[PDB]
Amino acid sequence: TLNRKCVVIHNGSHRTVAGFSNVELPQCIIPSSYIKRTEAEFIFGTYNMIDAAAEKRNGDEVYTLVDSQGLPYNWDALEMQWRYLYDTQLKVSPEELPLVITMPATNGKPDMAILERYYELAFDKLNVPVFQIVIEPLAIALSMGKSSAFVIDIGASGCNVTPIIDGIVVKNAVVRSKFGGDFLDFQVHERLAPLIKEEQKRSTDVWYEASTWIQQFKSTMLQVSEKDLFELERYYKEQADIYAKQQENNPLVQKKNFLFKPLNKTLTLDLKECYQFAEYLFKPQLISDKFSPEDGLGPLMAKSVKKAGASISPEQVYSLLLTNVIITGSTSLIEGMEQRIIKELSIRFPQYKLTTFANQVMMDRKIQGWLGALTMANLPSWSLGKWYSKEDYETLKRD
């Protein structure tokens, strides 16, 4: 292998992952947001922010670095974050080592403008020697031994569906849902509000709650039902009637208990109410009358495959993609999720056999994007990736 050690940085819209290419896990996972506390001042890091957030001090406000595109939109802040990472976590001059960072799949447009802002940050400001940009869905797929794959990423910003054929990304078939993890935070909060008393500028408390009890609730209460929930209900009812009538147990009546710490208070949901939260990802027409069933994850996956079949047979691409389905993302770890994504895919494409792949290790999908970039950085040849040097920048600067 090569005589080098890279810094690997992944700026997700929710989490930021950083570490060196020579070890199996990242040195740090910190929030892709910061507190601006006021003479201004910028707080980064999971415990630093949760401490400051709990202080409940006026003028403290949480801002974000990554928009819903998965792309950085506040570049002055991003530099401060990178400085923070290099200074306090990796503890190395940014000038020494090659850098590997990620971008999300796009349709192609915002690409050049981004690349430029990265030149300015990597070169003008940090003095990085050289960097590679890997495309998240692509790296994750490669890290998994796959050159062609339908990559279904369910993160905080929403679902990102990306067909990848023979190492190439099909941009026009790239699809980004708007409903994911962060959406789930909103719904858990709005729904539980009356039991916990509670029912931008108030960013600090929203954030702190999202990062504390709401995060635990998601990891322990929510489940995704295997089949359209409204149907599951009608069925379980229809069956329940017969057990009852017959003599003279509906699974949705099981209760689940969550200790809510801030008030030392038990919150009990029935299994249906637990299934209900993720149902919105699949049938978002159930919150507002302003969402079409087509904004739901099932129709969306289908849309993106069909748009893959338009290249540039279809019942071949369909077959390729569907035998290499990759399910990934923090939110994809919610119990029942893989199976519903599968059921939802299988019924839009009955003629085909689906085979899906997913990291089964809890940690590794939360940071599978970073894991992907890592396996790119450990590729044995410099010729395997585009490596931008200070040169490239100079030459772009000409007219």
Binding site: N3, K5, G19, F20, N22, V23, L25, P26, Q27, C28, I29, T46, Y47, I50, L90, K91, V92, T212, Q216, S219, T220, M221, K256, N257, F258, L259, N264, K265, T266, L333, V361, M362, M363, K366
Partner: protein
């Protein structure tokens, strides 16, 4: 390979450095060498630096290389290792004179590291050990792992290492230190001192430090029966004290606990998490204060245990007056425990386990160095091939 006479363990910390050369073979002994962690740095006109054990003719400056556990001066730190290492060679070379053919012929080194050390620092240290000290075999063992290996080898646990000015919190899952969860709070033993100064204004520092180190200072959660009790100055002066001797540990205990909670809550595999919460390991000088560990446990329970809120439970029991099943929660921890100490290291039992990290290293080094497999340390072979980078092919 290898002679047990020859195994050298060094455990450097901000104030002092525990050292041992040779393992006893019968049972493990608590390290007897404790060298203050500092070196003198004379500056020689023309720019360069020289390093001595004493202020040479009052010409040298006093460098303290490790602060808050972090290496702040990597050059003085390596000079300090050499100073220790050389001293050991001289000592043994006098006493026995055939030493260079026996005890000093192949010296493997185990260096206990701290979570905060750079990769850059770890590589430089590796280079120093192979190039300057001309040693041939090196393990760099993280402090956290030494801890878990001493504690009857725990796959999942949490280390709470209470220093003087800071406390490290370090979760271990599947025998791996979880770097992204690791952290320290800027708070430790001195906090007790500080709490006490506020409670006893007319005392001074040495008086307060003496109380903390006395038989009558404990954390509560027979001495506790007496309103007042007595203890003796560093200088033999008798001092009486009231309820203050059961105070001063609280602010620290609460701070550590809040941190432990946020940390373990970010372990993603709940099945791992449950295990960690059931193997809390507390280490460091402070922890030898009578009552301290149990008090810290008590607080983790009070703050974090998942269990039915008492009022809720009291209603349900009234209702059933007209047997109550246990409410099951989906969260962890429903059980919190301190990891069980091994009781079969007699010398260690005698002296307490505040420094048990070192026993971790005595065990690992014997394992590793008295068995052929070279999987967990850097050898000359490896150094010759990859250099300091060799280090990353034997991480645990």
């Amino acid at each position: 390979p290898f002679r047990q006479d020859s195994i050298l363990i060094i455990y450097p910390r901000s104030q002092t450095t525990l050292v041992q050369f040779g393992l006893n073979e019968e049972t493990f002994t608590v390290p007897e060498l404790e060298i203050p962690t500092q070196i003198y740095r004379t500056t020689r006109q023309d720019g360069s630096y020289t390093y001595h054990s004493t202020n040479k003719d009052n010409k040298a400056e006093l460098i303290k290389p490790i602060q808050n556990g972090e290496i702040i001066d990597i050059s003085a730190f390596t000079q300090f290792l050499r100073l220790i290492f050389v001293s050991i060679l001289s000592d043994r070379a006098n006493k026995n004179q055939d030493a260079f053919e026996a005890e000093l012929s192949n010296i493997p080194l185990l260096l206990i590291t701290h979570h905060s050390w750079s990769q850059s620092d770890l590589e430089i240290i590796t280079q120093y050990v192979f190039e300057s000290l001309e040693i041939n075999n090196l393990i760099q063992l993280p402090a956290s792992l030494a801890a878990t290996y001493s504690m009857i080898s725990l796959q999942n646990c949490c280390i709470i290492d209470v220093g003087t000015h800071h406390t490290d919190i370090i979760p271990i899952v599947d025998y791996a230190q979880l770097d992204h969860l690791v952290s320290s709070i800027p708070m430790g033993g001195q906090s007790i001192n500080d709490s006490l100064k506020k409670l006893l204004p007319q005392w001074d520092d040495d008086q307060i430090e003496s109380l903390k180190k006395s038989p009558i200072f404990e954390v509560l959660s027979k001495n506790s029966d007496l309103e007042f009790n007595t203890f003796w100055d560093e200088k033999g002066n008798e001092i009486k004290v009231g309820k203050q001797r059961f105070q001063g540990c609280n602010n620290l205990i609460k701070n550590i606990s809040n941190r432990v909670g946020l940390t373990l809550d970010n372990i993603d595999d709940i099945n791992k998490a449950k295990a960690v919460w059931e193997n809390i390991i507390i280490v460091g000088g402070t922890t030898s204060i009578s009552g301290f560990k149990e008090a810290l446990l008590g607080q983790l329970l009070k703050d974090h245990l998942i269990i039915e809120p008492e009022e809720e439970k009291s209603k349900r029991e009234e209702e059933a007056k007209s047997f109550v099943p246990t409410i099951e929660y989906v969260q962890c921890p429903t059980v919190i425990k301190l990891a069980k100490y091994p009781d079969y290291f007699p010398e260690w039992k005698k002296s307490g386990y505040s420094e048990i990290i070192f026993l971790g290293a005595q065990i690992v080094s014997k394992q590793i160095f008295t068995h052929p497999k070279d999987t967990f340390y850097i050898t000359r072979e490896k150094y010759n091939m990859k250099g300091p980078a060799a280090l990353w092919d034997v991480q645990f």
